[PDB]
Amino acid sequence: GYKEISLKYGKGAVDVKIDENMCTVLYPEDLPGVEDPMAEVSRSLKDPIGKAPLSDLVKGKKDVVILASDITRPSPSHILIPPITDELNRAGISDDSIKIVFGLGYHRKHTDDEKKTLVGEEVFNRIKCIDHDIDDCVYVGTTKRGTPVEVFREVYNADFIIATGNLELHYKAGYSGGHKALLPGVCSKNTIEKNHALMFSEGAMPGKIDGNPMREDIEEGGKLARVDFIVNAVLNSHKEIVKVVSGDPIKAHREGAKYIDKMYKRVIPEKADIVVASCGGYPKDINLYQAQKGLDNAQYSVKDGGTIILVAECREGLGEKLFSDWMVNSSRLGAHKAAVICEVLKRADIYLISSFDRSLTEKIFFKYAKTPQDALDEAIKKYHDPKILVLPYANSTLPYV
């Protein structure tokens, strides 16, 4: 039989026809956000994972620090933090025994309005909210891989440290959240630099924790810094909270990672021959830089010598300046993501179905085709009873071997 698959392209949809017994179509389970997010937080806190509830951990603490993400990495801190302070208050901790510290890493300080954006005005008024000061860190150890862990003094000073943030697939750390709120967020330039170098390894990839060297280094540095407790928001593709996990910085994170996996990880027997990947329509395919995200997910599942068919309009062009310059071999996140594309092209072919014309499409080293069918029908010929994987929401769907 012949299967007929709508693939979103730009602000509409194309179609492809594939022999069903030759292809698998992997879909995400993109769950909708909970109706009462702040109540899901409190539910989470009452049912913590791998560790006692806060009610039993904090009695007598006088210097509690809550880590939150900065304006750059939008997290629902304003949803997570108020229920946390409610438990801290309930357990006898005054608001003057509580501080919020923003994990800037390299980024600039926040204005006051940005701070109120992050935690809510009510929290900002009753609790001190401090930016990471990257020049005021204190050394607490060195990891097995040689990262010196140097932590902002205000976090160093604390007798209790709660880490909050998002928990999603991450292209290098495997997943965000857990100890990542601390390393690199509230660490010195030496710490960020040395940990950042681990992202260039073959084990730093989405959906991988054990044997991911960046994530293992993060969790090791966070242990040297004695993170006591996490509260993490598991986010859907619309960045809405679908679940909160609280408790042990490892066990609560692992349970959050399985909720993410149920939504977006899709385990395949083996790497397939042809991967047909849509970005899921505009604006996920608004430019090639953004479309690289579906392509990154898709290239863990293409065989050496395989063919990717990337269905992405790229209405507004190649995207971020560094990524584009690298891709056009002009005469640092963007540059890496472009080299990621180049490495895949050494292993496989990539067809680009886009608004680009043939000259430009082949300048940047993709195959050209006017439709997804034309690209498939062409490369289906170059393979022998091929396995064909179809990702209609490649930007959020991670095939995994």
Site residues (CB under 5 A) for Cl ion? 289, 319-320
CA separation, residue 137 to residues 160, 191, 228 (Å): 17, 10, 19
| Comparison of 177 and 319: residue with beta carbon closer to Cl ion | 319
| Comparison of 280 and 319: residue with beta carbon closer to Cl ion | 319
Strand ranges (E), 202-250 = 229-235, 241-247
Report, in Å, the least distance between residue 319 CB and Cl ion: 4
* Sequence-ordered list of residues with C-beta below 8 angstroms from that of 369, at least 6 positions apart, any chain: 309, 351, 352, 353, 375, 378
Report, in Å, the least distance between residue 312 CB and Cl ion: 13
Report, in Å, the least distance between residue 287 CB and Cl ion: 6
Tell me if 204 sits within 8 A of 213, measured CB to CB.
yes
| Comparison of 165 and 247: residue with beta carbon closer to Cl ion | 247
| Comparison of 107 and 189: residue with beta carbon closer to Cl ion | 107
Report, in Å, the least distance between residue 168 CB and Cl ion: 19
| Comparison of 207 and 319: residue with beta carbon closer to Cl ion | 319
Report, in Å, the least distance between residue 49 CB and Cl ion: 10
Helix (H, G, I), strand (E, B) or coil at 170: strand
* 308 sits in which H/E element: strand 302-311
> In terms of DSSP H, where are the helices of 91-161?
112-119, 121-126, 153-156
Report, in Å, the least distance between residue 57 CB and Cl ion: 10
CA atoms within 13 A on the CB side of 105: 16
| Comparison of 282 and 289: residue with beta carbon closer to Cl ion | 289
